[PDB]
Amino acid sequence: NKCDVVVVGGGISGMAAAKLLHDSGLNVVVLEARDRVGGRTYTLRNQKVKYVDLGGSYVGPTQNRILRLAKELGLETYKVNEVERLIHHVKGKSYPFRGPFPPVWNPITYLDHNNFWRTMDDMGREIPSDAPWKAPLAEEWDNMTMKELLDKLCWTESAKQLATLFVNLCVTAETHEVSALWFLWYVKQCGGTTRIISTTNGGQERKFVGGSGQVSERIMDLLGDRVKLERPVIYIDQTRENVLVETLNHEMYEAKYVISAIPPTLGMKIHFNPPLPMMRNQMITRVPLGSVIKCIVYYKEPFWRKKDYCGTMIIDGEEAPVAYTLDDTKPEGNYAAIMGFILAHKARKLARLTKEERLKKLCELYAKVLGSLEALEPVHYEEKNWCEEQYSGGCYTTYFPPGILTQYGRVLRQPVDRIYFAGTETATHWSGYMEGAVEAGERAAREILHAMGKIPEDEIWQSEPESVDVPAQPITTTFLERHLPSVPGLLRLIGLTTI
Template sequence: MAPQEADVLIVGAGLSGLIAARTVLAAGLTPLILEADTRVGGRILTEELGGLPVELGAQWIGDTHHRMFALAAELGVQTYPQYDDGETSYELAGTGVLRGNEFHSRFGDELAELEKVLRRLDELAAEVSPATPWTAPHAAEWDAITAGAWYDAQGLSPAARTLLEICTVGILAVPTVEVSFLHLLFTIQTCGVTSELFAESEGGAQTTRFVGGTAEIPNRLAALISEHIVFESPVQLIEYGTDSVVVHCRGGRTATGKRVIVALSPMLAGRIGYDPPLSGYRDQLTQRMPNSAAMKAFFIYDEPFWRSDGLNGQLISDIGPARMSNDTCVLGDDRGVILLFLEGEQARTHTQWSEEDRRAALTAELVRHFGDRAARPLHYLDGEWGSRQWTRGCYNANCGPLVWTTYGPALAEPIGPIHWASTDTATEWSAYMEGAVEAGERAAREVIEALTA
């Protein structure tokens, strides 16, 4: 098989890789994307259930995700607002199931204390540079403890502490005892403030969806550069010199170029062989940035019956199996769709269950919160990310204690002709699609500057 040639080789056809390829092409350079899977999108995955698009991967953008709004408009993908009318259903700290108004009335003082903690997080995060978090004045102190330990020290009531844990795990998809406090502050700073992370209403990170499904974005991007994408080409080895690279794929495919952008999560990038080997410094980093654990489960009903009961389809529970849910009905369709999230320990545990047992447990949870009609769905589908060969986890990579301050500079710094791009390397909205676009643009700029200077 003759080697393929391009100016810039790109490993991975996720959003970062696609954006990098298009940016490189617009600068007059030739890209070639080598994708291990049979599809584009990476951690974006839209599947069909009962004739409706359901998002097993990335689903929302928020009001300040300006790159994604611009990209959707350019590609002709329409958007619509996330449904948010009505009360949330709570089940925390032994309260039983409470509707939102009752929960807030009963725990008003505790929630006021929680709000103070969130404001304190915003104040501390403001001291962290998204580009160099290890340089924060208290970086050594913050990186030596976990986010969970800091939360525990705030004197919150059990209900407030549990609510804070659930909301944070909903973002990071790992327990807070596994994440350094500095990493939590970094995440907050890349996204603005805590209200933009945790809110689904105006200003939050989950306010807007895509008509036709999120996969419309990578699919339409890929259609524009289809001749520059090769599928079923898992990269096994990258040989590199000062200004040249040779990429070897499983099955014997090779490609040569002047630069390579590895548009994979740090952990997956670390599983590729490099010749000469990368420094131990870089390798130690990728060993310490595992992908998180997430599962999504969808129930489709004949109608969104919870809305007539004054509920918004959202639940927050410390009993589970799911910790949170969402009304994820599709615009223009009368059927009701509930999405349940299992993240962190819940995903790790319940992926080991049979689908029958998992569905039964989730159904029982929905019945507790939304009544007996929840037991009669038309369709069910769930999907977990750790078992997916070319992803091995979702939504993002997280740093445990002492990773940022010890190895942080290695995350996005190019090594010779090798550049890094994934949402995990972003300095704006890291771990989101917005961050994936920012990272792809940044890596492409590095390559363009190097090859056109």
Template sequence: MAPRDDRPEVKFCDAPGMPDPGFYSHAVSLNQTNRLVFTSGIIAQRPDGSFPESLEEQAKAVYNNLQQALEKSCASPRDVIKVTFYAVDWSLEQGEVLIKLFLDFMTDEHGTTHRPITTLIPVTKLAITGAKLEIEVVAAVGGHASRYAGPSIRSFDRPVAPAKVDVVVVGGGFSGIQAAWDVQKAGLSCVLLEAKHRIGGRSRSQQLQSGPGIIELGATWINKKTQPKVYATAKRLGLDIVDQYTEGDEVWQFQDGTILRARPGSPEAEQMTQFNVALCEVIDGECQNIDIRRFDEFPTALDVSMETWSESKGLSDDMGKAALKFFTSAVVGRDPAEIGMHYFLDYIKSGGGFISIATEGEDGAQSLKIKQGTSAIATGLADEMKPGSIFINSPVDNIHQTAEGALVHTATGDKIFCRKVIIAIPTNTYGMIHFSPPLPHDKRALVSRTKPGVYAKMILTYSRPWWKELGLVGKFSSFRGPICFSWDISDHTRKQYSLAMFIAGEIAAKWATLNELQRIEAVIDHLSQLLGPEHAHLAKDSVLEVNYVNWPEEEYLGGAPTSAMGPGMLSRYGAALRQPFKHIHFAGGETAFEWKGYLEGALSAGSRAADEVIAWAKQEDLIRKVSANL
């Protein structure tokens, strides 16, 4: 099994001009996206064991070695948060030299000096004779997920953030990247601040360790016919689009443990089809009463939980309850008792209906894959932006609005004044930002009650596509779990054979209580069970690599694929979801009208928020021109 991308990592660094090991840096994981880098024993010893005579020469060598240590730990002087100096025979005269060289080291190419916490400890001597200065540094940097190895992403160059721009976009998911791309194309100055160590949000395309091929740990599919914006963007970026594999039998497991292999045209398949059609007709029939752009017209008395609604529709038998729970968990990562009927029907209609969301093929949401990975869309857009306009590892923690604009603070110490802010993060994470003045009541009431989806995705990569050899399409569905549903995400041109296993809802919450090895064992054991005794060994014997993400554990996201709402929330507060607040505009996939929770919706919502800002800019420009002529 290949290591997951969020595990702690230790790096030992050698620097030119120092005997091995000379110094080391040790990276310790703080959480799933951030880590501390500790450096120790950084001195100025030459390869022959000697030292420069003067403190100034030694200090220059020490800072040079520190630079090497930081770079090898994927850090920079900008990331330094704590410095400890050990100086021999300290004096104020020495201090002037030492401090001047240190400030030079901490000053970037744009003239900004970063000032971490420092401690000076005078000593009579150091461990190695001849050393006059030793330094220890602690830096805080991002985590270890491999970034998509595609375009150069010039906008990731790390200059200091500008003090003033027209627009700040908060959040580097698809919606934020699209919004920033749009406002820059309109001629406005813009920076994007992303809290995590990567862009792409709930998309995570990752290179396999066991061989060629890219797997999708997040968003995976697009559609040419029903999702025009994301499809057109992928084509414009020159990405390779391939059809989802759809040939073969499906395997179903029902609540009582019965396992059914459904061959196309067989009585078993017909039975499943009839049941799905019946459920589809009930849900799609109710969707006809939904206006996805008007939220206050839905009858309040009917906006009960999906569980209560299903009982009123005669879906109260064990099969009906299990099927609805399966479907709501698969779609939004929540059980029927947690979801309001209005919200769920609005979500289904926004995706074109039950069949559209649940199927593959020309009209299905699981229609097409991107050979380079969906994250290539985000990195492709980023690569077209102005260099130096995207800042990762930059969580926003405070937005203070004034009459002229807003001052945006990051946890890393940057302060940027802008005329407009676009918030493009999940609504369940708004609480991580202090808004001054506070958000309006209705928006606050809504975002404080949205429920991020409980969702995990595990990719099992095999040495051969044994499911196709058995005549299976790769779709394993279970009402019991831990596997809830799956798809084949192989790339035969690269001899990459992978199955994507989804764990959702209450089942995912229980599965998450296991440790890492138990989680993997549970999924593989379940797949073996679904295959039956004769073929069970295939699920276990040829595994090359296992990768997974449990999305509720992802900091700054908290779940996937979206955030759901309970009864009454959408009718009461839906209009506030997208409504600007003074200088702040709101994007993010949840704010989309069509295709909420999908890449299409995220891009569309980003463009909608950008259009609001661009329209304001045009109006401001008109006002300036009129004023100039008076």
């Protein structure tokens, strides 16, 4: 079975790579482990839900590559409901609000909160998107956990608790599990704190009509029989003139080049000849994925809207199974639903329960948070625990524990002879997202076009025109946000005055 390029993995990244190469007139094969394409995207269809995303779902302004690819495939977006009030639930009580950040009134707490978000972005600006290990304090920042950074930075428990939730929710891991440098990089390369946490004008603004799984499905339709399902790759041999790729089901593929479009650690499932170089050999043992269960509770009507709640709940407490929800009602206003994430250690703990037991705990939580008995009357439930997936390893993405990004980060997308590396983890803008998957797949594909002498080197990395359908409002700060003192800043001001 001979071709120009074998693509290992049929997620968005591998499918985007294969489509680009196909369009450029090369012969490509996609080898996919599962009986389906889409990977960490999966759209379930049945009569009770019509369609529902159980994996990656949201897209927003500045994610121009996924929007362009989706639009070319004939897909459309709609806006996630944020008409009514958001809810912050903390210490057993709900506080409705507007705007992206839960507000605080206590003046000291206000300064601490303001300084926390500001400092995340300040540190971010020191970190190159394409080379985080080149930050001036890369080593110092990489040698501490996010827990350690929050302990230093947050002078109030209020700010520390919200910051903790921010980390758990954005990277499906505990603050003590992840590198501070890596987390700060991750946020900055999404455009900063406001962009990453926002619905309106941020990452959660929109979803695809009919589900995100259609992106991979529609590319498979374009590629025809070039996509091979239930072909897990077990062996890559680069000792001869052409690369040999072998699958579990006893097939051999021969190619000039290979794109690895799988999560970095899942490279461990492949035996390499010759052995990988030392730094990659070790890197792929050091980069786990996070832990999450995505849960959707269906209701007769979006009853929360009648109480002037949009369906967004930011829920702080150890007893709460879910820390974040969004309205998942269809744009037509039917199949009323609340989507919630069970995160990090809670995914581990609550996976021990039955599906029926998890549904009951979510409804009881939502009833309390929304002050609504109607939340106790679900009509349907769907969920997906991504921790159990052999060919994902977790969700949403790969996290770096302390010390790893500075020692091993440079080899993430370094070619190994005729193997090139795609997958969202290798992106420099919205790495961890569907957007980053498209950036990495197309970049890897063009690395091979360059190696073949079909394009000049300056065309490997390509800028993306802004979407005309999803324009990006700039991120702005106020004078007060920029110049109000931190808590230690204020204490320094007090000590000075009184002298």
